[PDB]
Amino acid sequence: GEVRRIKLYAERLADGQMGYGLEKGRATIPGPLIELNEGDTLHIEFENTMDVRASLHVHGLDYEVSSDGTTLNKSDVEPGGTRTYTWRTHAPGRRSDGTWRAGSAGYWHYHDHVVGTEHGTGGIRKGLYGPVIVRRKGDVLPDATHTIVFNDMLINNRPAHSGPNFEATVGDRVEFVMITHGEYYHTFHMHGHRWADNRTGMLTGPDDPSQVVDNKIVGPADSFGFQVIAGEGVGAGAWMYHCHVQSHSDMGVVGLFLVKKTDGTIPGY
Amino acid sequence: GEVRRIKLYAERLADGQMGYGLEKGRATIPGPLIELNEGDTLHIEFENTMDVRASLHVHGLDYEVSSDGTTLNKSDVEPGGTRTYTWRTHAPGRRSDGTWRAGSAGYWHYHDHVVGTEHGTGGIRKGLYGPVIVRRKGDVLPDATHTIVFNDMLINNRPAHSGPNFEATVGDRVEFVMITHGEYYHTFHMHGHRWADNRTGMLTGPDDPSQVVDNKIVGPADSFGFQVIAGEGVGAGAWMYHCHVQSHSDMGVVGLFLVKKTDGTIPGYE
Amino acid sequence: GGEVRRIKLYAERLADGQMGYGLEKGRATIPGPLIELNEGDTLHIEFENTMDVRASLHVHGLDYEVSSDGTTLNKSDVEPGGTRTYTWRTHAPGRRSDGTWRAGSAGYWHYHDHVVGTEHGTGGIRKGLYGPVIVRRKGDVLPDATHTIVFNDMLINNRPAHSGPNFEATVGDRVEFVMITHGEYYHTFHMHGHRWADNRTGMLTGPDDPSQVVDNKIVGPADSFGFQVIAGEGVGAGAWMYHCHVQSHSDMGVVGLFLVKKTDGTIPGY
Ligand SMILES: [Cu+2]
Ligand SMILES: [Cu+2]
Ligand SMILES: [Cu+2]
Ligand SMILES: [Cu+2]
Ligand SMILES: [Cu+2]
Ligand SMILES: [Cu+2]
Ligand SMILES: [Cu+2]
Ligand SMILES: [Cu+2]
Ligand SMILES: [Cu+2]
Ligand SMILES: [Cu+2]
What we know:
Organism of A, B, C: Streptomyces sviceus ATCC 29083
Assembly: trimeric
Largest sheet of chain A: 5 strands, mixed
Keywords: Laccase, Ssl1, Cu-binding protein, oxidoreductase
Structural class of chain A: mainly beta
Oligomer: homotrimer
Order of helices and strands of chain A: EEEEEEEEEHEEEEEEEEEEEHE
CATH class of the largest domain in chain A: Mainly Beta
Bound molecules: copper (II) ion
PDB class: oxidoreductase
Chains A, B, C: Copper oxidase
């Protein structure tokens, strides 16, 4: 694949949060989406603009201990400090012994591993997480990608009973990245939409046995994703997504997948 | 792909519980099993006979906003009032864009969405849940079908140390639907039997790499099913099924898959 | 495969209020010894309960009659100082007379006591009466070494917290992990620098295998999965943290090291 270079900033935010950003003062929670094709290399010029030690750890991708982002492998960043982390990816292939080497492709995530504790409980709690997508050659690309993060009892570190809305048009091919962090198990559910419990979130073809689901138990540091055709077989509407743990939904871990008709209207909303 | 109509009533029961039934005063917990072939449409003539608002939301199957069963999409039911709910299904096909549309086939469930709160915490707690099986052309059909719901710390809203038993004979193709509800994660286990972590609960053949398990972690609104040849390779016996979370089995989330010999006997148990 | 095997196995109290399975009197370990079988194999376990309380042997996944359930229910537990021969059987997958595919015994399985403390072995599990079982399919690739990580309540292999076990391998070694969970709590098992397949073997079969590829897996009491990695594949030598990813679990010390060595013997940054 291609070699690529980006800048990443860890920053303090209002209400004592902590974001990553591609640009200083544009830090988000979750952090910016990172999109890669199998075989790509990413060199990340990472600057800690905070008064506390921070790091960048990644799930699933290839990295050397020198890019672990852990005090253990001395890969964290002093306050004000800079470090360039290297993530590599590979494509699948038979090894020489006959066995199949799984590719790097999947729905993954990066997070701090040193804020609060040597496991980044503080960083994670404050908002130092975001999505990685590693694509395979042939994978179908979406019209948009939306990142939903169950962080303890919040979605994307928002004040509860205010979970984020996502706008789309019927027939649009919408991608969701679903990441979980903190202490608690959850179940992610979506009204009017289904996906496949497999790498991609859609069945490869008729030979794919993967269960089809609208509900998934997820624990801290689990990542999955899936694409749907917005409105497929159900029409336009305010389509609720929510944590299906009853106390979680009642305390307001809910948002709307707002699927507009072609004309721009929405039924009874 | 045939169109169908059935009547469903929400009723308050004895001991302050709530349940769906196919007739008046015949409501069960779980609710009655709904079985569909892909393509089939089901129109549900639903009546809320209770003194509180109630609804019917479904997982997995195709419905419009007007069958969401939510406060949001004004698709819940006043006390005593009626509403006709529509669930469509679809077979798997090729989309124009060359991708594979998945198909509605799978182990699913229906549950109230307004009784307790705007997510029916109260309805679910009181027993407003039931199983839906959507079948695909060629799916092997069972000799019998037994629904097991881990709702909070009970099975099928029974008293504890009292979880249901299911009788069967050696060789029976027995189907289980396993639904989870409320606040707590669980692990469903079964002695003497195992299944595949996939759609049908059966391996398609030797090119099915899916994990063969007898123990599966589940949380609120998770649905799976499977089919076993009763007592396959293990013989007749009282075959325990139990939540494997230790305090959960200890407090009485246990039941018996009672697998009789052909002559109707069973080896001695307690 | 297709061989009859015989072993002896003891239950024993240990130091610090613990109980262990062992191949010999006084050599009990926590976890108990790894039992490795090929599909078709029958294992006869000459079990002796050296302890002062009723203990059993119950196994997940494998084939056993109720006379080897090791339950109160089926009266197959063992009196203090008693001996009982448990029989585990295993079958290869095969086409059934109903045209369906019979799932094989092969996978990542476990054995635990069912009668110490409660009729669900709560006390026996807590105190260390658990061990791993692997059943191999014909032509399964065999590892260079096998390592067992049990998440029992808040600990690993009933060790004192902040001191989880380390495993040593050289870059290029085929390293197998058995990953069992017991007790009351859900966990997520994670490993730095390595990935596996959510499927029977923890390895994709080929390009036809849609299994999700994961470094993080939610597990609950009595969940068992396993996988094999090439040590340092595409990441190189190093101290490769494995940890529960439940933040307070990792904080309270549920961590260990996959110590992957360069070929010369060294570890960068040690
Ligand atoms: Cu880590
Ligand atoms: Cu939640
Ligand atoms: Cu992590
Ligand atoms: Cu629901
Ligand atoms: Cu809902
Ligand atoms: Cu339970
Ligand atoms: Cu009796
Ligand atoms: Cu049991
Ligand atoms: Cu844990
Ligand atoms: Cu067990």
